[PDB]
Nucleic acid binder design. Structure first.
Ligand SMILES: *O[C@H]1[C@@H](O)[C@H](n2cnc3c(=O)[nH]c(N)nc32)O[C@@H]1COP(=O)(O)OP(=O)(O)OP(=O)(O)O
Ligand SMILES: [Zn+2]
Length: 635
RNA sequence: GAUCGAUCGAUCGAUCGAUCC
């Protein structure tokens, strides 16, 4: 039921101006949006109709908003619908927009329509409600819609422009250090959304924090393990592996010049990636031994990266989980190739496993971080035996490691697997939320806490400055509410004018396409895949090959997670068709009725014909060549 | 295919996670 708390938030928006209203709850925002929609559709006299649009960022929240708006708007006779990726396939979105009032289509669909030509002007709507409007920062679909709105407004042909009332929970600080930078960031966010009012609770503070999270911070600084026997063995393995890898690459220490790297860190992973990308561009004129050298170097770098990931897992999660990860990687990589390099690496890993398994089964090598985690979990479940806990981790490789640790450790039997009846839920990013644990990560049931287990004071300082940023953001919101609506309007107008100017400035013209007929080669094999003359672009995003020689140059493999995205339908993945390469080259899809193995320029190296330099790109946008459109009349 | 956030490294690059088409 609409109470005074919702009316205080909805009042500054019913006048007819955009707002940056922010509520710490979700049901409050939903109810406020409902009342705003009602007051906007009921204020229009006879002869006019409303076209309020709601922008949901995710599919679950989209379905929730669609259900709520369909259940609420049943006695008013309003056409409420919604479009998504599984709905805008061969459907007249223009007829849906023109024959409905409360459409809840996604922002990406509206951006694609504005780019294609459908819905030319943004003045057809009369009310825009951007859910979670704090994402309007850079290159966002919300930001693209706002750029279109500003281009239509400041361009001099602004017609019946709709309201741009937003809806978020936290305004956000970003990277602000002092109050002035926070105020500048908030003003830039408000000008990007083109709003002069920031509605928030200022009078009804009595009933605000009744259903508010209100968390508690319980930072616990822990130290790492000292008995790094497993780490020592893995470091010796990586050391002799890098030593025997320099037999073919004498300049391996000069390909990446950053600093002295240590095993078990992210800097070592970056060094591995850099030396891999630097050795993948070898130009030996033999073209037969170069392939073997590149394959051996790729195998060496992949094994080193897997060892580094195992070291990171053993440092963060348990040791047996890292050993199981290594064994699983070696089992999955053994059935692929049987060459001398892989056989030597596998036999060395098997020789070291006889001691690795003995070190892993030693009960005196338990991580103290997991020890204090188990201790605090036990004390929290002894305080209350009905706590639904959530455990955030950095990398997904720990979501199963901690799950196996919970299932195996006998000191905690009240827990249940919660990989994302379920007691603890081990996830990575985002119910009851009775307790949150940030294990090296940087709601309801009032009385919840938030533990921060970390072996570094850097995360503690980051959380402290984040709390300070939240406080100064609240202060800046208060200061902006103190200001008037006129000077704020002039300020946001100047800010958005400068934004439009700098945006029109950074407009790179069409680059000269490389008329040469360069070719593409595999990453870990350096085999001739296809020339650029046989590469056809479909919709300025996807690239495919239609040659007949390339059709037998790959092998198919069943896709573990197939899904269609508005243009194709997945069928399988494509891999390199060589002796023991099995490298990912792309994915097999169907556009309308044919079958196309669309490849990615990331897993390829570009070699010229005239010069011969082996270039390496990451995205198709960086590859500047003659992009011939895919014509279905050929094949 | 694009976007976002975090970490790291030389205005850019790598990894991770999430989102959409
Ligand atoms: O070039 C990309 C891209 O064209 C295509 N692709 C795969 N999924 C999508 C999608 O959801 N939406 C769009 N627009 N394009 C998609 O795959 C090419 C790259 O192949 P990848 O193996 O890297 O991607 P894939 O989905 O096959 O596997 P993964 O990256 O998720 O692990
Ligand atoms: Zn290959």
């Amino acid at each position: 039921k609409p109470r005074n708390y919702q009316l205080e938030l909805a009042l500054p928006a019913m006048k007819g101006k955009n707002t940056i209203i922010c509520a710490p709850t979700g049901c409050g925002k939903t109810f406020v949006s409902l009342l705003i929609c009602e007051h906007h559709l009921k204020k229009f006299p006879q002869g006019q109709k409303g076209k309020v649009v709601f922008f949901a960022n995710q599919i679950p929240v989209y379905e929730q908003q669609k259900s709520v708006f369909s259940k609420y708007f049943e006695r008013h006779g309003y056409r409420v619908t919604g479009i998504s990726g599984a709905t805008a396939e061969n459907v007249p979105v223009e007829q849906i927009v023109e024959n409905n009032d409360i459409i809840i289509l996604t922002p990406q669909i509206l951006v694609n329509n504005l780019k294609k030509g459908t819905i030319p002007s943004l003045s057809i709507f009369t009310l825009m409600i951007f859910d979670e409007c704090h994402n309007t920062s850079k290159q966002h679909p919300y930001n693209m819609i706002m750029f279109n709105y500003l281009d239509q407004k400041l361009g001099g042909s602004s017609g019946p422009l709709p309201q741009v009332i937003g809806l978020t929970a936290s305004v956000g600080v970003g990277d602000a250090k002092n109050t002035d930078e926070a105020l500048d960031y908030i003003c830039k966010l408000c000008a990007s959304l083109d709003a002069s009012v920031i509605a928030t609770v200022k009078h009804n503070l009595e009933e605000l924090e009744q259903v508010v999270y209100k968390p508690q911070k319980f930072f616990r600084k822990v130290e790492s393990r000292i008995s790094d026997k497993f780490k020592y063995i893995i470091a010796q393995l990586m050391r002799d592996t890098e030593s025997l890898a320099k037999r073919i690459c004498k300049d391996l220490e000069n390909l990446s010049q950053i600093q002295n790297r240590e095993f078990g860190t992210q800097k070592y992973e970056q060094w591995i990636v850099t030396v891999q990308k630097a050795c993948m561009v070898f130009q030996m004129p033999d073209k037969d031994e170069e392939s073997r050298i590149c394959k051996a170097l790729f195998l060496y770098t992949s094994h080193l990266r897997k060892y580094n990931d195992a070291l990171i897992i053993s440092e963060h999660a348990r040791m047996k989980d890292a050993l199981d990860y290594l064994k699983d990687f070696f089992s999955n990589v053994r059935a692929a190739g049987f060459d001398e390099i892989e056989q030597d690496l596998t036999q060395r890993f098997e020789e070291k496993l006889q001691e690795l398994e003995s070190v892993s089964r030693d009960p005196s090598n338990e991580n103290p971080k997991l020890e204090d985690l188990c201790f605090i979990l036990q004390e929290e479940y002894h305080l209350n035996p009905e706590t639904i806990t959530i455990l955030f981790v950095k990398t997904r490789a720990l979501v199963d490691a901690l799950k196996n640790w919970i299932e195996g450790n006998p000191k905690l039997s009240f827990l249940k697997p919660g990989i994302l009846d379920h007691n603890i839920l081990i996830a990575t990013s985002v119910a009851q939320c009775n307790l949150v644990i940030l294990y090296e990560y940087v709601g309801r049931a009032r009385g919840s806490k938030c533990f921060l287990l970390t072996s570094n004071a850097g995360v503690i300082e980051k959380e402290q400055i984040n709390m300070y940023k939240e406080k100064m953001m609240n202060d800046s919101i208060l200061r902006l509410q103190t200001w008037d609506e006129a000077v704020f309007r002039e300020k946001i107008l100047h800010i958005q004018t400068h934004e439009k100017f700098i945006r029109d400035s950074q407009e790179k013209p069409k680059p000269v396409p490389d008329k040469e007929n360069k070719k593409l080669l595999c990453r870990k094999c350096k085999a001739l895949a296809c020339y650029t003359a046989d590469v056809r672009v479909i919709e300025e995003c996807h690239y495919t090959v239609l040659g007949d020689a390339f059709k037998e140059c790959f092998v198919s493999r069943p896709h573990p997670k197939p899904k269609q995205f508005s243009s194709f339908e997945k069928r399988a993945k494509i891999f390199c068709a060589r002796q023991n390469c099995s490298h990912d080259w792309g994915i097999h899809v169907k556009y309308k009725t044919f079958e196309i193995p669309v490849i990615k320029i990331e897993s390829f190296v570009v070699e010229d014909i005239a010069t011969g330099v082996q270039t390496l790109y990451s995205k198709w946008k960086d590859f500047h060549f003659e992009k011939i459109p895919f014509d279905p009349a050929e094949m």
